[PDB]
Design a protein around this ligand. Structure first.
Ligand SMILES: O=S1(=O)NCN(C2CC2)c2cc(CCc3ccc4c(c3)N(C3CC3)CNS4(=O)=O)ccc21
Ligand SMILES: N[C@@H](CCC(=O)O)C(=O)O
Ligand SMILES: N[C@@H](CCC(=O)O)C(=O)O
Ligand SMILES: [Cl-]
Ligand SMILES: [Cl-]
Ligand SMILES: [Cl-]
Lengths: 264, 264
């Protein structure tokens, strides 16, 4: 690509990055809109670099293959030198922090439960103590790894069920998990991050609900290859945007409730 | 060189660090108990260092004098080489990040409003639109700087009032702010971090309340002098304790398991 241009890896995930209406006649960064598109523009302005948004080739967030030890997803693109920075809903985790750098967080989230409205589930404990309602997570992301690694009794029990459930309770994209909730007549619940849960809850057909408290507490960060010279300025830019109120403004914009569900 | 005892700066702020019963016949770290005492022990165990807890001499979190540019508080202890690490409810901020290192956050908070029960205030906007009820913040901390720096109309209006109010609406310790709320018959409201607010709400005589949403969203981090080699291990330890659920257990221990205002 062009010299001095920062390659940004990101992922198609609403409302963080979405294809604009009529994107097929657009070019470059103008094809895309969303929270992370606006955030990328703000970060680049404060840090003084030009950049190219690139959608992660395999469509994944990032997991390490237990056998090959190879990273996939956006994490892999950073580790193996395909991208200079990830600006995406990429969760800060211990295993990732060991291999890439993360800015201070720009958005809070926790794992949460999505049900079809009326499902008799109020908590993770509820899910773990029954079998009529199946439940699962996104593949190749931090939610699945959380359950795989957890020694907390309820979550360990949930993982033991999910890992062996047939047919697979895992999905390839957030959209597939939501569709499965909507089409399973209450017999599937989807474990996903509270940010995405709350976005979908305010979208037609208004048939999903977040139930219970969040299962953990963490955040998204802007990620760079370990030791990258970009890390320092990006981190200071995140904190400046936080303190100016602009991260709150951006959340309000992209989670804006136009009233598709009820009064608004 | 040889391992050396790590000097930890911290602050007497309940329930983070408190004097134990019988402290008058105890020495060293055994004088103290609290959330940050337990956290210091966990971090030290995971990182393999011995340490000495030392209460910051001036009792302050940390601000930079506009004239001398000298840092006070725990931040100053780190900047000037008096302590090796700060394990305290020390808020991550841009101006502090420029001069010290912060781990990833170990606790979330936002600025919030504390009222005496029954005070006719529900929001910061409510406070800004009246004059019968005075309000202020802690000195030498991130809350006061937030109002000083805010360009948001409501918060700017609040700062313009607070900076010139007579008598002073600012307090030197959280405890003084709590006393002023409790003794002022509903005519003082205290602006403080949601963590401290929610703790006091569970303490006798159960006469205070947190009202409204939080005004911002941030966190506390473990701080080290810029470039300190201790930072890397401490950061990984925070993320491990987070993922294991131990930070959540520690918050429940010191906020709610011991609460004095019932089981609700
Ligand atoms: O995975 S973590 O790193 N570790 C574990 N935890 C839990 C607390 C124990 C969290 C919790 C959060 C959300 C609270 C939070 C903390 C710090 C900041 C926040 C928001 N902001 C706000 C825009 C979101 C701005 N910058 S900031 O001042 O750094 C994020 C990341 C993590
Ligand atoms: N934000 C997650 C993806 C979504 C999920 O796992 O629920 C990650 O960075 O892996
Ligand atoms: N946590 C704050 C102190 C409390 C406050 O300012 O409300 C700081 O680090 O400065
Ligand atoms: Cl289109
Ligand atoms: Cl458990
Ligand atoms: Cl020790």
């Amino acid at each position: 690509g062009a010299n001095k241009t920062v390659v940004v890896t990101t992922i198609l995930e609403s409302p963080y990055v979405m294809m604009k209406k009529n994107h097929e006649m657009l070019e470059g960064n103008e094809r895309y809109e969303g929270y992370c598109v606006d955030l990328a523009a703000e970060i680049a302005k404060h840090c003084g670099f030009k950049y190219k948004l690139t959608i992660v080739g395999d469509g994944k967030y990032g997991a390490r293959d237990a056998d090959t030890k190879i990273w996939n997803g956006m994490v892999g693109e950073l580790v193996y030198g395909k991208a200079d920075i990830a600006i995406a809903p990429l969760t800060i985790t211990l295993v990732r922090e060991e291999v890439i750098d993360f800015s201070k967080p720009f958005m809070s989230l926790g794992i949460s439960i999505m049900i079809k409205k009326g499902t008799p589930i109020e908590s993770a404990e509820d899910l773990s103590k029954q079998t009529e309602i199946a439940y699962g997570t996104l593949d190749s992301g931090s939610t699945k790894e959380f359950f795989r690694r957890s020694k907390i009794a309820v979550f360990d029990k949930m993982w033991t069920y999910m890992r062996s459930a047939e047919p697979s309770v895992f999905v390839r994209t957030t959209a597939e998990g939501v569709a499965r909730v909507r089409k399973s007549k209450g017999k599937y619940a989807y474990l996903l991050e509270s940010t995405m849960n709350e976005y979908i809850e305010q979208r037609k057909p208004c048939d999903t609900m977040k139930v219970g408290g969040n299962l953990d507490s963490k955040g998204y960060g802007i990620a760079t290859p370990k030791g990258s010279s970009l890390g320092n300025a990006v981190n200071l830019a995140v904190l400046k945007l936080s303190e100016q109120g602009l991260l709150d403004k951006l959340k309000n914009k992209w989670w804006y409730d136009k009233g598709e569900c009820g009064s608004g």
